């Protein structure tokens, strides 16, 4: 007994314009491939290879470049130099 | 430049087969001659003449297209199919 009112007269929605003809034959294999590649993260799972790359690029490489960066803060000036002059501060 | 014709391919292949020893005769040679039956060639002498014909026209043949040219007319049409001379 509750229906939206009679004075609506709602019509269809177009997007309008010119039917651009198909400039591309889509490949089913290429489209399935690319849809698998962009949405890879919803099927990603941890394995030993994932653990190896996640260890080395997220943990080991920041720690190595970290140690190298904190050791070498005020070591080197080369600004005006001479023979027999050490360039390391330490 | 230098563009071949059909009769050029004809007198190249005929003179080629006239050079060859294991033919039957130099006189029974035609455009429609079977290499296997009419010329008296083995299973393996037709291969040596396909090697010589592909060296002679300067062109390369895959194994699927070499066995198909059984008669001489098929060889002339097939060699005339390619753009390279």
């Amino acid at each position: 007994e509750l229906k939206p009112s009679s004075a609506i007269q709602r019509g269809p929605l177009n997007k309008g314009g010119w039917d651009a003809p198909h400039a591309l034959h889509n490949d089913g294999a290429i489209d399935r491939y690319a849809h698998w590649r962009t949405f890879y993260q919803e099927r990603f799972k941890y394995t030993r290879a994932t653990g190896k790359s996640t260890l080395i690029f997220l943990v080991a490489f920041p720690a190595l470049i970290g140690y190298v960066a904190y050791q070498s803060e005020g070591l080197f000036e080369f600004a005006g130099k001479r023979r027999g002059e050490s360039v390391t501060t330490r | 430049a230098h563009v071949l014709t059909k009769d050029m391919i004809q007198e190249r292949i005929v003179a080629l087969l006239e050079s060859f020893d294991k033919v039957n005769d130099a006189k029974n040679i035609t455009a429609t001659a079977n290499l296997t039956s009419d010329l008296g060639l083995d299973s393996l002498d037709v291969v040596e003449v396909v090697m010589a014909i592909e060296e002679e026209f300067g062109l390369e043949i895959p194994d699927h297209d070499a066995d198909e040219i059984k008669t001489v007319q098929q060889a002339i049409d097939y060699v005339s199919a390619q753009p390279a001379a």
Binding site: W18, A20 | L44, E60, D63, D67
Partner: protein
Amino acid sequence: PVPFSAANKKLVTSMYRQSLKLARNWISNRQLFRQKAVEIRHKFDQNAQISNPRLLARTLDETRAHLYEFRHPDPIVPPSFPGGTKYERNVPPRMEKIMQHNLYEP
């Protein structure tokens, strides 16, 4: 693996085309090459009368391995062909009218 037949014929013809072409790019001289090719031919003439399948397949894959040992770094290709250097220099563009995508400007 099988005696006189069309498929065994196709295999042995393919292997002979190979062994000729393979010997072709090792050897620079004409004279030594055509000697060698006559020898190669004599190796194929001494065979091709073998009755059993056992020794036939034995010599078959043995000369296939002997064919694999004498492989060459660059095969002589004609240049207009897919190993060559003239391959795909000016491939002619296929004749296409222009597809249009915009109602308003080209």
